[PDB]
Amino acid sequence: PVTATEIRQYLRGHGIPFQDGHSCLRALSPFSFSLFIDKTTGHFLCMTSLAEGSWEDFQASVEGEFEDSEEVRRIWNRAIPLWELPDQEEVQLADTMFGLTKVTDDTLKRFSVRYLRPARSLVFPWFSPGGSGLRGLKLLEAKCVSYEETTIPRPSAYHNLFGLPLISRRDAEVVLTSRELDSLALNQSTGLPTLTLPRGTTCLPPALLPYLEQFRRIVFWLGDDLRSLEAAKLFARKLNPKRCFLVRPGDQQPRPLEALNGGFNLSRILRTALPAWHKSIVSFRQLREEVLGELSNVEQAAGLRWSRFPDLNRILKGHRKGELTVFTGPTGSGKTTFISEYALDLCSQGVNTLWGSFEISNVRLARVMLTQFAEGRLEDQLDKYDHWADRFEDLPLYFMTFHGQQSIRTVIDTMQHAVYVYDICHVIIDNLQFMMGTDRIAAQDYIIGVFRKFATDNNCHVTLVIHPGSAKASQEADNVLILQDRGKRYLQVSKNRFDGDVGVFPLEFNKNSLTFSI
Template structure:
């Protein structure tokens, strides 16, 4: 009988007035679709269907009071079975969008997924905004619709940084290429909030909801949370106010299937100590609500500029955590070390020297001419090769000595002959 009931969208189960009938009704509901089934709970006011008909009780009223077999906040594995299989069969798609500029980040987070909350922190002056702009730009270049909420710096300055990272070169020195790069940058699905400075949480959330509906935004960057705490009169306790704001962003990410990246300043700690998850300003709610926690570590050295690392201290999706180095390029303002090319960098340096000291390039340009005399050095073996010719006349010297020697050889002969005649 049950297979014939599966064709109906709404199935009320009213079996009897005893406990056994109630248990049987719940069993049938589990075998059928629990979302389609409703149960009539037995009782004195709700007897079995036959007895209710004999008493003249309104059957429609009894069916209207039936309880749903499933609760909207409770599901069973049967309802999740297909979704679990889909995640197992499509591992790469479930992992999300991969970063192209940060392959090491893919090893830990596996990708950028919708509906998650990422908390990002780092020391003051370490380049949090510069890093997170390239972090978001990388995803935006792959078609991830992004909404930027920059409360700390103006949109013009932020767009300038992102355009430099997009072009991987200083456009101040290549103004003739500005229109070309600007046209390409304009095609990206990138939007900016017009807020600057302290803003109310309600205004920000309403703007985010509108952007999700109108522009299909799937990634929102908030830089940073502290600019909304001073405006909210939720509580005199700043920690309680921050917890409320973090909870609101967590709910927004889950309800709208949108990834929210939240920048939070750390506590004031010793500069020589590395930041930890507990270093995030506020209570532990921020790190507890977050799916991912990223920390920009800045290890400063006394002898020169330090090294910067990105630490993944929490990863709810995969569990892998770790740290990897970042290669910052001041020319392209990128932490991925991506530049236009070494030849391009050398050209930029020459142009800078020409602007500062126009007379210096002349001797520098003459330096490459020095190899010419060096190339003439191999010509020196030529006179060395002529040395054997000089030995040739020396070889004739015996001929010159020979007549002199013959003269000397004749003189002893008469002396010898005279002495030989005396005896």
């Protein structure tokens, strides 16, 4: 709830000379403008003092922390660099499975890419911004051709930008890659500075924003799918899209790793980058690639495909961004368990989800959702609980804890804050009456319009569950889901913004596994 003007006037209180630089303001550090203040969160960070915290921490600091030490040097010491391997069969097998046929040993030395023998996996080190020891390791394993990502520490704390020590202060152009292998190929040929997102197209933590402040031109290259382009656009809004460019996906525009392997020239691809910022009026030139992609990716024109609800997939046909849907049904039918299952299935595919359930006792909700993840009854499997707990704490999944605050204004800024900090791509609220907290009809209409305004402006998909349909709700909402009863129930959809397809299908619910089936 702190605006940029409030940040500026607070700095003027201490008389600290600050310069408005892109996203995070730069000023001389009181504890050459090393001090950086986040525009939206006020999270301070110094390039020299290396101090981080909240805005309230900064306020208390002018009046009058972490080590992250883990047994990770052992893994580094027990792994051999790829370019220092005298073996012939081992290295040839290594590049074939990881697609490193065209990767030269010079790039390996520059990026310090290491290889581990016990599991035959790549090693991607994390270097401290201050030149200290290793901060973490990222491991990629090839299985069959599928790549498995494993990192130490947990992915929620993994904030490594590959090539950060390599890039210099005199560099203004940087290209971001969703993976790390494609970054090696991109730097090998173009030679321009490049960086990799921590968890790919999952999310971009704001802590990494100050490191990218120096660059003036930024080109996004995060895959070869419409989902990657949408993820790039969300990332663009954080970094003042007036200073960044995009590379549209296409048949002739593959990923940098495949482009070098396939022999296609990548300099032309980088040259045809289109601006991510547009005026209120645009021409067809900035849309030629998008229309071509939709013409050959009609399956990608919609959202992701659910792996547990084929019947829902054949009617809704996807889960887009910005669209708002409303779910409703009679009480006592467990309409709160289904939405947890619906969110969990989408969450398993790499979608950021946020839970703002009210009057549900979210502690109990976490238990129900975890049982759904286990696809069974966890009471009997209490012995094997740590294994599923570790698997549970790697998906993008977050919860909202409101103790006394219930106003509509309060929840909006917190939801907006959540999107900025963790790239929340999906928000679900269980009870809307608790937010309240002809008057009831008018109040219900007002809050629904606010959510529709928030969903459209922020492009984040929002799902509202209604506890007793409401007047004027259908016009504002894009989709409707009704779970009626006849533990057997059926879902009926009578409004589809994207497709205009309606229908109804039955469902079978089992309390043993808390998972619906048909």
